[PDB]
Amino acid sequence: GLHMQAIWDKWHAFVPRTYDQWSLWNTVDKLLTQYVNASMETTACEVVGTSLSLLNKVLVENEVGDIYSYLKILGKGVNELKSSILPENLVNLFNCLASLDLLHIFIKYTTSSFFLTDDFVRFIRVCFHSRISGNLLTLLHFDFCSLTTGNILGRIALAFTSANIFEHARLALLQHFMDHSSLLAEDSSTKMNLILLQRYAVIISIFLDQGKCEKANDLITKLSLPYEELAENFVSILEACKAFLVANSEFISYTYTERFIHSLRFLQKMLKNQGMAYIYFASGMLLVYVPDKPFDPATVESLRHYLESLYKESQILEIAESLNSGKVNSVMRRLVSTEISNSTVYRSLNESIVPLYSELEFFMKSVVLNQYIFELAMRLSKESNIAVVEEAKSFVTKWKAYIERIREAYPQFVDVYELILSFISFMIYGIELLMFEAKRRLDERSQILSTLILTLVDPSSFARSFDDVSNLIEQIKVLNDSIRFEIYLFLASRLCSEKQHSSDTHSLANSFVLLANEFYIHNAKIKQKELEEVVIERKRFLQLQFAFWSLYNEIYSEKMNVIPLEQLMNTGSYLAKKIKVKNPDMIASSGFDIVSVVLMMGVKSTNE
């Protein structure tokens, strides 16, 4: 049981009411499905979809007929596009751009927005660029990598190893990211912290309406100027708890949501605080939307058969007043005549929602079971070996299966399904922060490898270390190795470049000594294999050791340090390209450092 009808009246958003309006929506959906599949020709098809957008906007203004004409014209052009590339992978980069698009779409838009904004048009261009399963959820109105730029590494892996069309699409996604430059540059998931804050603020506005303190709290909550929002977010959470006192009981997950939020608003390891506050507020608002039966903002047919009885008795009154006198009027007739003197809903002529209610009842009865929820809170406390990451994956997978079965059927209950989708999105955001922390604390050697790859590739990593050289040597011990020996040579090249600027006797000499002991152990392993393709690998290792002793002697010479930092940068770029060719695993990701400086190195990865 819940109230949930004024809540369903709180948004009660615009949607198709006429059967013809919903038919036009479905036709436009099939049209864009054929149409958003596949240069400057892509910008032309973007203008074509923009024409489709303005046309469906006119259709939303209750305009018919000429819609069917321009639709037949669009169908001719769509069969033409069906008549008039380069198979690959890592389209998850395009999905990440779509995630950033939905992020910016929620981000700058607090009031009403049909998403016609210009950057948003570029997002639509990338969305047509990137075919997706979902039926325009955003139009009607994919999150996890908020700190994980390691798929950028997969982009570097895509940059590691038709091919001209691949470099063309590389430059395409590159110019798109140059357009998506400021579209994520501000605050990785600290923006999403404010977004969950805005979702909680939406629940807070949904609490009370005309209470002047609550109206002022929702107004200031609507007054989320992002600098001032980050300034008084704590005052907002405090006043939120204060108004939560003013309401009724059972706000326990809602109260602890604010506690874990103030942590996630401030705390490192706050992915746990993020998932905790997200799951707690999601449980609060989900129980807020938890009626035991259907009562939304969603007939009077007694007037139908009533006026039918009035009219048919008026007819019978005339047919009897015939046999009374023979003129067509009566006091009975004038009486029943004076008695006969006495929006945009969906066309609901049959709404047998018992099966759809049972379908929602299974997915929310697992929630009424809540052993998923309770066991997830228990695992999200601590103590996961590895199995809870796979458990959160399987739970979100069964959730995605139920969500797909939901997005498949049920022509009715559309707004209810949309609200359930937003709620399951918040739950999956909590589950995402949780499974992310689970993979983080599960193991980190490949994450240490990813940090080393970030140490292998950044100008911040190229800023200016011998103990850190020993740390990297311990990583190489923990780390093929001849390619890692080439990486050690690249490190020695950086050492010689820093040697050029200024000279420290202890660091330079002990560093060369460390590299010498490394090469000595390498020659030891080489002679051990000699006591024992791979021979060509040993030959390449011999050529490598030849260049090593040559540059060592030249470094022990140090006659003239002609080391171009441009060539050093291209060398670090090629080392990163070899590392992108090296990495075979699918688990780790970037620890929220950069993807744009990586795109600045991705610029070199596409060029030269």
Residues 6+ apart with CB under 8 A from 248: none
CA distances from 314 to 80, 263, 303, 306 (A): 61, 73, 16, 12
**Integer Cα distance of 341 and 407 in angstroms:** 47
Per-residue buried b or exposed e for 3-15, using 16+ beta carbons within 10 Å of the residue's own CB: ebeebbeeeeeee
Contact, 156 vs 594, CB < 8 A?
no
Candidates 461, 496, 456, 459; CA nearest to 479 is 456
Contact, 149 vs 596, CB < 8 A?
no
Question: How many CB atoms lie under 10 A from the CB of residue 307?
Answer: 13
Candidates 148, 201, 228, 140; CA nearest to 415 is 140
Which ranges constitute the DSSP H helices of 208-343?
212-222, 226-231, 233-246, 252-264, 271-288, 302-324, 331-341
Q: Which amino acid is at 545?
A: Q
Contact, 453 vs 585, CB < 8 A?
no
Q: Which amino acid is at 217?
A: N
Between CA 188 and CA 268, with CA 94 as vertex, the angle to 5 degrees is 20
**Integer Cα distance of 491 and 497 in angstroms:** 10
**Integer Cα distance of 516 and 509 in angstroms:** 10
Task: Count the alpha carbons within 13 Å of 519 in the hemisphere toward its beta carbon.
Answer: 20
Say what the alpha-carbon torsion angle 421, 426, 430, 435 is, to the nearest 10 degrees.
Answer: 30
**Integer Cα distance of 93 and 99 in angstroms:** 10
Between CA 115 and CA 124, with CA 118 as vertex, the angle to 5 degrees is 60
Residues 6+ apart with CB under 8 A from 93: 151, 152, 154, 155, 158, 173
Give the method used.
cryo-EM
Task: Count the alpha carbons within 13 Å of 163 in the hemisphere toward its beta carbon.
Answer: 2
Say what the alpha-carbon torsion angle 381, 382, 388, 393 is, to the nearest 10 degrees.
Answer: 50
Contact, 204 vs 218, CB < 8 A?
yes
**Integer Cα distance of 295 and 2 in angstroms:** 9
Candidates 245, 370, 250; CA nearest to 1 is 250
Contact, 202 vs 123, CB < 8 A?
no
Contact, 363 vs 402, CB < 8 A?
yes
Task: Count the alpha carbons within 13 Å of 30 in the hemisphere toward its beta carbon.
Answer: 8
Contact, 595 vs 188, CB < 8 A?
no
Burial class of residue 256, CB neighbours in 10 A (0-12, 13-18, 19+): middle
- Going by the DSSP 8-state scheme, the letter that residue 444 receives in this structure is -
Helix (H, G, I), strand (E, B) or coil at 203: helix
Unique residue bearing structure tokens 């015939």:
322
Candidates 69, 46, 60; CA nearest to 127 is 46
| Angle subtended by helix axes 414-442 and 387-408, to nearest 10 | 160
Sign of the Cα pseudo-torsion (412, 416, 421, 422, in order): positive
Helix (H, G, I), strand (E, B) or coil at 28: helix
Contact, 24 vs 67, CB < 8 A?
yes
| Angle subtended by helix axes 271-288 and 414-442, to nearest 10 | 160
**Integer Cα distance of 179 and 211 in angstroms:** 44
Candidates 222, 215, 219; CA nearest to 198 is 222
Contact, 257 vs 240, CB < 8 A?
no
**Integer Cα distance of 246 and 491 in angstroms:** 63
| Angle subtended by helix axes 190-207 and 233-246, to nearest 10 | 30
**Integer Cα distance of 263 and 303 in angstroms:** 58
**Integer Cα distance of 557 and 537 in angstroms:** 29
**Integer Cα distance of 454 and 460 in angstroms:** 9
Contact, 242 vs 276, CB < 8 A?
no
Unique residue bearing structure tokens 């809870």:
388
Unique residue bearing structure tokens 């970030």:
454
Long-range (24+ apart) CB contacts under 8 A made by 79-85 are 81/34, 81/35, 81/37, 81/38, 81/45, 82/34, 85/38, 85/165
- Going by the DSSP 8-state scheme, the letter that residue 183 receives in this structure is T
**Integer Cα distance of 518 and 487 in angstroms:** 12
